[PDB]
Design a protein around this ligand. Structure first.
Ligand code: NDP
Ligand code: IXE
Length: 206
């Protein structure tokens, strides 16, 4: 009653797998903002009327979101923390692992519920990404690759774009990214903030 759904990871990272610096993201990318909001919020119209996507995030990532942007609107938010006592407010769900979050979600958004789970996204940070990359239901990575070795203090845990992982993770065609996201997506290099970046979708077989 717990693993009938794939997990998707969404991440922005450098070519050296850097993902963060000083509890924030060391870049200011307008399209990337638009894209993260769209991908995590989009529900295909063939999915049920009640459907909403889930964002799962680590406690440090939650604490990095400014209060005025919390919870992330139009998505079911879950914070993974081993601190049972931590008050999230607004009915935001708290869970002590990735699988505890999945069990809580299925228990809460059940047969009857006016809200039903659609896609489930892991949105960071580094420690939660490590658990997700180990999870047997993770099959899809929406990667924004940043073409500059911007100095970071936190790194992505598995080098999924590198030769060593290339028999498991495969980059899909841009039109398949656009099919899955349901909307035209900029194709190829985008240049803001002094360097190029681009959107990619990588998948693996479970
Ligand atoms: N580039 C990107 O796409 C993204 C980058 N980031 C960057 O990541 C950095 C933060 O990463 P990190 O410090 O790793 O923080 P996380 O957001 O992963 O938060 C870590 C805390 O979350 C909880 N936690 C995480 N994983 C688990 C687990 N598997 N089981 C139980 N609890 C877990 C623990 O909370 P507790 O201590 O309360 O028990 C842990 O101390 C920041 O720089 C941020 O800006 C964040 C999101 C996206
Ligand atoms: C953690 N985070 C974030 C932080 C905030 F303060 C926000 F208001 C927000 F919408 C997202 C964030 C931002 N952009 C991202 N982009 C990609 N591609 N992947 C992520 N997981 C991500 C997370």
């Amino acid at each position: 009653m717990n693993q009938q759904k794939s997990l998707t990871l969404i991440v922005a990272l450098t070519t050296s797998y850097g993902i963060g610096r000083s509890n924030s993201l060391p870049w200011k990318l307008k399209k990337e903002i638009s894209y993260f909001k769209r991908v995590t919020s989009f529900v295909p119209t063939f999915d049920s009327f009640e459907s909403m996507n889930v964002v799962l995030m680590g406690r440090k990532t939650w604490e990095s979101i400014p209060l005025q942007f919390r919870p992330l609107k139009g998505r079911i938010n879950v914070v993974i923390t081993r601190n049972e006592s931590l008050d999230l407010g607004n009915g935001i769900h708290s869970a002590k692992s990735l699988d505890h979050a999945l069990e809580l979600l299925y228990r809460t958004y059940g047969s009857e519920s006016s809200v039903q789970i659609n896609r489930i996204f892991v949105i960071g940070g580094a420690q939660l990404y490590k658990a997700a990359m180990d999870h047997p239901k993770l099959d899809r990575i929406m990667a924004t690759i940043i073409y500059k070795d911007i100095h970071c203090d936190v790194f992505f845990p598995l080098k999924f774009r590198d030769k060593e992982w290339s028999s498991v993770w495969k980059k899909e065609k841009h039109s398949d990214l656009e099919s899955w996201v349901g909307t035209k997506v900029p194709h190829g290099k985008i240049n803001e903030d002094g360097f190029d970046y681009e959107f990619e979708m990588w998948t693996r077989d479970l």
